[PDB]
Design a binder for these strands. Sequence first.
DNA 1: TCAATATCCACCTGCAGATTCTACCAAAAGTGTATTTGGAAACTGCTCCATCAAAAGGCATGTTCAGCTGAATTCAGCTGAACATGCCTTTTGATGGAGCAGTTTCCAAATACACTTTTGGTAGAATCTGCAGGTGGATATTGAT
DNA 2: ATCAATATCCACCTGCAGATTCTACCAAAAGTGTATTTGGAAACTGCTCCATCAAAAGGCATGTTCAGCTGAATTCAGCTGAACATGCCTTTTGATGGAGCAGTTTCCAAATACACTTTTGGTAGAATCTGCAGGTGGATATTGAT
Lengths: 96, 99, 104, 108, 77, 87, 91, 92
Amino acid sequence: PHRYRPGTVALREIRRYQKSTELLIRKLPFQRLVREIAQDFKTDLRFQSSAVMALQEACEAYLVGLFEDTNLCAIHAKRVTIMPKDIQLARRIRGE
Amino acid sequence: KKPHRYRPGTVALREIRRYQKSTELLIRKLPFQRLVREIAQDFKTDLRFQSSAVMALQEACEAYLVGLFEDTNLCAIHAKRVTIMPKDIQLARRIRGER
Amino acid sequence: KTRSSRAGLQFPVGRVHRLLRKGNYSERVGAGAPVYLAAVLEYLTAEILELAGNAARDNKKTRIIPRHLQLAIRNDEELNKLLGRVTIAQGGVLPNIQAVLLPK
Amino acid sequence: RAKAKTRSSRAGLQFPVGRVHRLLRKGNYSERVGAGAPVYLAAVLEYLTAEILELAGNAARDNKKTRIIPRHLQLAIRNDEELNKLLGRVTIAQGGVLPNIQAVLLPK
Amino acid sequence: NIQGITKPAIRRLARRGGVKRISGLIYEETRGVLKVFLENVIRDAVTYTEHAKRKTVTAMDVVYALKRQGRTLYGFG
Amino acid sequence: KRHRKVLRDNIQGITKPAIRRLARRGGVKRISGLIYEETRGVLKVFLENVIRDAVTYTEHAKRKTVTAMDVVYALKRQGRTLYGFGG
Amino acid sequence: RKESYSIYVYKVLKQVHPDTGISSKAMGIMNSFVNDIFERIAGEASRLAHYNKRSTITSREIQTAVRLLLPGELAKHAVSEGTKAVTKYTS
Amino acid sequence: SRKESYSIYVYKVLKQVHPDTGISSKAMGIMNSFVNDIFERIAGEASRLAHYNKRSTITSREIQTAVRLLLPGELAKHAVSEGTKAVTKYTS
DNA sequence: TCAATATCCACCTGCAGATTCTACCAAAAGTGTATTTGGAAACTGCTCCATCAAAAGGCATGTTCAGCTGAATTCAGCTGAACATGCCTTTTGATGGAGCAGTTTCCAAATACACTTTTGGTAGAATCTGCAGGTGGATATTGAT
DNA sequence: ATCAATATCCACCTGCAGATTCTACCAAAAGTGTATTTGGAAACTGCTCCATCAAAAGGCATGTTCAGCTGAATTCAGCTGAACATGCCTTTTGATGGAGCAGTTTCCAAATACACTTTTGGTAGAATCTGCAGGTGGATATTGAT
Ligand SMILES: [Cl-]
Ligand SMILES: [Cl-]
Ligand SMILES: [Cl-]
Ligand SMILES: [Cl-]
Ligand SMILES: [Mn+2]
Ligand SMILES: [Mn+2]
Ligand SMILES: [Mn+2]
Ligand SMILES: [Mn+2]
Ligand SMILES: [Mn+2]
Ligand SMILES: [Mn+2]
Ligand SMILES: [Mn+2]
Ligand SMILES: [Mn+2]
Ligand SMILES: [Mn+2]
Ligand SMILES: [Mn+2]
């Protein structure tokens, strides 16, 4: 039976998702998360649809960029695998 | 009685403690001033400078370089090195959004 | 006769002038300021639309979409610099894989 | 005419309400400015000044100095998480840095 | 609800970020990071909402929060 | 009408030991030989960018003297706010 | 009512690519763009006027603001267009 | 040649919090820079707030919201407490 | 354990820098009139929120193994430590005068205001572009030599 | 270091749903015709600071030597993370009400603007005042040794 070697399909996915623009997190759980977080700041809140979509576009753009920097940190350490310490270095240098 | 010698790194660490304890500018005043005037003159000729303007520029520059060296150091350590290298600087600046 | 027409512009000189007057920028606004500003905004719009139109045509699309704007902007060094801290919704990213990740 | 009372005294403040009001008027922030706005602003500026001076004074005494210098301001700000956050992109002239050596650099 | 941001979703985000290989510990880390981000933005957004004396967070509330955090977003004005 | 000796190659005034001292304050224990030149390039770029903006302000004000405030404004608009040089 | 730059963006688009259209989302991004650059330039011009104790924002402040905000060639071409437009307008 | 600054008010506050402590000229310059900086941030955010909401007036409400946007956590809470107290005392 | 060296820690005083004193006056405060605005009340649609339901496709799980990461190990050459030499920075002060500020005057350019003309926003109609799937060829990968 | 077999990618296709472009009505915004005011440029001029140089003392930069230790290179395997198959449940998609908010509009009481007049807190410069910088010297702590 056929099996691709470790890495081939990963690369295929990179090309695939860098080619496209669709949101990568599921709508409903993101919305649920947003409402949960919002509740600890202000009671009785409602949300415009486009407000939640705005938050998702912003969040996903942020995470993708962070993963770019994280990847650079992993490669810097002569690895190809990203690890929490890569994220933490990236966020420290960003001033986060 | 062979002369005294500190091992590589001991004096470096001592210097770190020394210069992190203090606040004096670490670049020589007059050469920095010449640098500022040369660069400014390549934008507009015959410019003059308030004294405090050059001093402001030096404070800004040294603060910038010190912070950059902090991030660079973190990049070196990340790569399991103790020696900072140009690629460390370049990574730090790439992640900062300077490059 | 409109001010935009006299200035050879498509962007609205009158509107830009009003937005300057009411934006709490200064107590007064010169007559040339909204003309200059409108001209600059129109220029930048034209540059971006030029490149984005190109990207749209490569994609054999007759309509410019956010993706084409992102491609146009990030592939242009100076536009990318100008919009360095800006997120284009539904823009995605530039195709880019670090060489070390590739086979061989 | 009634005896002069200043707005700072009326507000219980040390920072100048009148001056802050004038700066708001001439800074082109809005066409109109409420009576409470410069009072509120002056109070906030005064408070933040007080927090930084409190911590900086503390550092000065820890260093057995009676006079606050830029170093003390830097120590006060960087050793306080919220002030450090507020002034995250700010350079304190002649402030230096916090003593900090990465553990991996120390001898074994 | 943070666990609703699933592993394959985070993987897709990382792929778009150009990542080829991913440690198992990334996912939880990512979640923490995401939460912090969201919190900050939303905290500001709601502040705007409250100033306008509204009970509905608008797209503009979010846009202003993002802008003032140096993360300007185009497309939702 | 007695101008100074023309300024040249002054970036080299940012010496190796000076860069070492800056790195020490930054917590650096060991330094590759190639760092110093690298640092100079970085510093020059930074300086150029600040001074350019500063001079722009000076030129807008129709002055021939760069002021501390010109520099402060340049730095502020470059997201590197500097305290201590107002007034 | 609710203002945008949409019709002007479309006119420019028709100038540079006569047979090209634009999606709603893309137009929203263009509007965001124009408002953003407007704010940047107007704000810098405001500060320029304030620093120099002037109560009037003139084309000179706009031009200087453009020089401060725009990189290189974009700055030069923008300055050229603004100057040209003001010159055509004045007569 | 008359140049205004916040020096005397900073000094009065200093004497409030540390009665036997002084301050160097350089440090005072940093404090003046600080006050002007925060002034600009708060006033600017308030201006934006009033604009967003189609109000021509910056009131203590705009100041307060700006303070909440700009300041971290407890610092924000404490500042809001001081401003509110000051405005209510002023009103009386 | 020592010798060698650096850093720590009081103690000292004089003078450069900080604080206080003084008194004029710029700007804040009092007062009165003019002009703008905030909100309470009364509305109207229109987005959301709540709820229900089916079903699709995305995710969770378990298995197998390929290959990546980390540890261990080896070496040569670079960088840190130390030292002499002497340059050029630092410090303090002179000497001109370039160029900021400060004043005064007066138009070119801006605001103000009353009223008309033109334009841009909006929602539905009319066009016509993408996209949803499905094909076939291009391209790329895998395992075997 | 090529080959045969295989899987996925990528144009290209059509038909038609729906997203965009076109249209027309109409408040609102820009334009316009005049009148009137004013910000700031020009021309001065006084007088701070700024440019440049000078001397001298010694702090610091430079060049050298050389050996410790680091970075770089290499080896190897254990265990992690990728790929793939399977079947369950969460999300997606669609329908239906209706209650909650935005979003508007009207009108006075309340708030703010702004000019005039008057007063005092803030400033600049002078006079006092006084930390702490260096200079001294000894205790203590760390370092590297053969
Ligand atoms: Cl890790
Ligand atoms: Cl390197
Ligand atoms: Cl108020
Ligand atoms: Cl003008
Ligand atoms: Mn030159
Ligand atoms: Mn007077
Ligand atoms: Mn009139
Ligand atoms: Mn029309
Ligand atoms: Mn398809
Ligand atoms: Mn005048
Ligand atoms: Mn090593
Ligand atoms: Mn194995
Ligand atoms: Mn008095
Ligand atoms: Mn001392």
